[PDB]
Amino acid sequence: GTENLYFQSNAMKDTFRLENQTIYFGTERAISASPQTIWRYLTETDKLKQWFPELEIGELGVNGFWRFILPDFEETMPFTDYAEEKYLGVTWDTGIIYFDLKEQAPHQTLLVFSESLPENFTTPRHKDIAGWSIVLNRLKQVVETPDAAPEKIDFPQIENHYLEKLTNLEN
Template sequence: MLATIQKQPNNYVVTFTRSLAHSIDAVWAVLTENDKLQKWMSNLEVIDLQKNGKMHFNRNDGTDAFEEITITDYAKQQTLEFDWGKDSVRFELSMTREGSILVLQETISELTDHTPKDLAGWHICLELLCDLLNGIVHDEFPMEQWRKWFAEYELLIAHVENN
């Protein structure tokens, strides 16, 4: 399911929503435990899981280079928010009778040529996360699927910018 983009007075809020047939415990584990997290978002690493704690965005380029990310909001099994460059990424979990709902919101200060790439990346990462919860681990990032979603997000952003 394609994300939604809402234009705010000073930024844009992109929202991805996924209904999952998995418990909050299971989803929280794939968001916060490095051995699981890195199976759907290989660049992220939790260092200190708490508000004002740290994460690393690892370059994964053969060096040990990384960017330090600050966790700006945290409530165990409910909320994980962190800096994403000039922007922010927020995960929220809530329970349903069938499992849980995962909401990913990226707050973006300005739309750029890179934005649809980033959104397509999050889209694919959420698919990988869902697959991981269902016991499927991907050895490689699915670039063909990413290209498909990149084209969709280019159209969505063009629509938002023209309205």
């Protein structure tokens, strides 16, 4: 299987910082499509669900929002920033996720993902980061190869990797 190598290849530019108990995480995905194509996967429910099945669009625009839906739980996630085909900031748990679509070439984009995880995050922070790394890998895969089989990943292994990254930030 190629799952381990695909995961490593997409973790290459993970970055972490700790400031005043808040963890900041950044990563990047090089995706062979235009920013306009990738923007649809953040702003249309049928595309958003291809990579993050629990999410749906609420509304778009400067007052837009996503919704997170599970059988036992629904929540709205207001946008904190919105620029068509450029960037999107969304409330996430007690912090923020941010998508920045950087054009590399007419059909190549660097999607720069960054996140703020305060100490009161409800999910253990390394598990939330592991989850984002996994679904961002799926986003790249569905944009480039729409019917590739999903990655059979080893969640505990990925979660441990991120545990060690965060633990290293402690003084």
